[PDB]
Amino acid sequence: VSNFLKDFLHKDRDDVNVEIVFLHNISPNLELEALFKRHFTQVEFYQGSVLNPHDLARVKIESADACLILANKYCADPDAEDASNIMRVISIKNYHPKIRIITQMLQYHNKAHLLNIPS
């Protein structure tokens, strides 16, 4: 989140009126709370799961400009992480097929699964 916000909310970036809504079931710790407080005018956080359509309705995924999915680069099984992210993509596209998705993939052979989604 720190790296993404450092590049996205850069001071030299031209004026863009785009807010950021984080959706995550794990509650943030003190450092994430401080980081979200530092950007309280541009960043909001919500506790919930992507796989739950109620939480997708909560963050207004049907009117969002895009959905960005970050991966766990430090995990025991990269294939399990990739499959979980692909399933998140499947859930989001099942809720709203026209939303733009930018996702992170760990292994190269897994992104072929994304071609199995007609949306």
């Binding site: 499959a83 979980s84 499947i90």
Partner: protein, 186 residues
């Protein structure tokens, strides 16, 4: 004698008990019915399942080339997401109803298990007495294995997972099977 019925409501079922030919034969409307008082072994010991002599697992394992050489049509492909250390699912409960001796030998459907051989060797000691069962030791997620068993000609593809206890999050327990399905459809 007790009888089993399929019906929308339990009120109509009592007509099967209150029926009498004397004063209900002329009645057409069912709702008007009332209670008016007017040398070689081929089957198992009980003879209800197809049986064959026990065979070693080496004689049913197929390579990809060997599976491609044989022609499979109208068969059942069971894709399994098993492991050497995972809970057994009891595949015999899938194979006994398909070898039920109501069917002739030519009507039996070939069963091909696609999955890890480390998992399937732990199941084989309950499956080695059934006639037409083969193993492709590969992965359900690989298209080459699926093309080797002619999945476009099977009567049914059954996708099962065995690693349900390992995954902690409940909704993410189905990621493999779902992906497998989306692979086969594409």
């Amino acid at each position: 004698t007790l009888g089993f019925f399929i019906a929308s409501d339990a009120k109509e079922v009592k007509r099967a008990f209150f029926y009498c030919k004397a004063c209900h034969d002329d009645i057409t409307d069912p709702k008007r019915i009332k209670k008016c008082g007017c040398n070689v072994k081929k089957y198992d010991s009980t003879g209800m399942f197809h049986w064959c002599a026990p065979k070693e697992i080496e004689k049913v394992i197929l390579t990809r080339s060997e599976a491609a050489m044989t022609v499979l049509s109208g068969h059942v492909v069971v894709c399994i997401f098993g492991d050497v250390s995972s809970a057994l699912i009891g595949l015999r409960n899938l194979v006994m109803p398909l070898r039920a001796s109501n069917f002739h030998y030519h009507e039996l459907k070939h069963i091909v298990f696609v999955g890890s051989i480390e998992y399937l060797k732990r199941e084989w000691e309950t499956l080695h007495n059934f006639p037409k069962v083969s193993i492709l030791p590969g992965t359900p997620l690989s298209r080459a294995d699926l093309r080797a068993v002619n999945i476009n000609l099977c009567d049914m593809c059954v996708i099962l997972s065995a690693n349900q206890n390992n995954i902690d999050d409940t909704s993410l327990q189905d990621k493999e099977c779902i992906l497998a399905s989306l692979n086969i459809k594409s």
